[PDB]
Amino acid sequence: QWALEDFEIGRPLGKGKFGNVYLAREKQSKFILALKVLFKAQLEKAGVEHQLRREVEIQSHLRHPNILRLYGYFHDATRVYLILEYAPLGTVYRELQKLSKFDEQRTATYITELANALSYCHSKRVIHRDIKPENLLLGSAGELKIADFGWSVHAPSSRRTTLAGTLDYLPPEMIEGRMHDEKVDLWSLGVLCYEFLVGKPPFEANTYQETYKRISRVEFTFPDFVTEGARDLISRLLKHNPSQRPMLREVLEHPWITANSSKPS
Ligand SMILES: Nc1ncnc2c1ncn2[C@@H]1O[C@H](COP(=O)(O)OP(=O)(O)O)[C@@H](O)[C@H]1O
Ligand SMILES: Nc1snnc1-c1ccc(C(F)(F)F)cc1
Ligand SMILES: [Cl-]
Ligand SMILES: [Cl-]
Ligand SMILES: [Mg+2]
Ligand SMILES: [Mg+2]
DSSP, X not given: OOOGGGEEEEEEEEEOSSOEEEEEEETTTOOEEEEEEEEHHHHHHHTOHHHHHHHHHHHHHOOOTTBOOEEEEEXXXXXXXXXXXXXXXXXXXXXXHHHSSOOHHHHHHHHHHHHHHHHHHHTTTXXXXXXXXXXXXXXXXXXXXXXXXXXXXXXXXXOOSOOOSOOTTOOHHHHTTOOBOTHHHHHHHHHHHHHHHHSSOTTOOSSHHHHHHHXXXXXXOOOTTSOHHHHHHHHHHOOSSGGGSOOHHHHHTOHHHHHHOSSOO
């Protein structure tokens, strides 16, 4: 169906390990979108063809206001193209670097939107497993949208692919290569809440080996300015035993969230 000739390419929107994303406009409809370009050669080399198919299949059937749309795909002799919804206000990552840290109302609103989107995902037993600021985009009204479903699977699961970059957002069971389920996303939710309020993730360290150690032992402390309500929520989410982590309904109905968020469930 679609081919490259159907689109006019614009400015670079961002880069990932494999993804090279551009602003684009479809010629006949003038529809503005984001084009995610991947190189077949590096995809074959890393042997992650299965990750790309899972990304296309899972994301294209999901329909939720806080989840980025995937309209379609096409491919030539060298590249693969994903046709995505364009997010005009950029990443949460960039926004965090601008402001250094978010206030309690901004943080609570983001968490509510995340919890809403994850609740929808888990209802189909879809787990994301790669929730971090670079993969959270912002709509035209500043609303949060989850993207990059390249690591997503159906629960329960093991891990068959090599862990690439940072360990900062992964729970002990995933890092120790053990079996895991939906509760991995809730650990990540706890890591984000901390980083949103503090300015850096709770287990950050100088080396891979040390970050590994702090995560498996759950070693984190709060700065003085973090209030009692925030500490309660974060402490509940960062449990070593996954079955002790709260349900998403509990997060959405937490007194600190309900008092500070500006959006409903
Ligand atoms: N729909 C989009 N709108 C705006 N920017 C995007 C969009 N998709 C991706 N980007 C930018 O490109 C970067 C990489 O996209 P992503 O799909 O996460 O690539 P990868 O899967 O290689 O990590 C993101 O961090 C973001 O900054
Ligand atoms: N042809 C090659 S080579 N390496 N990956 C591919 C590939 C990966 C994903 C798809 C997709 F259909 F899911 F979109 C198609 C092709
Ligand atoms: Cl290109
Ligand atoms: Cl306190
Ligand atoms: Mg990404
Ligand atoms: Mg990816």
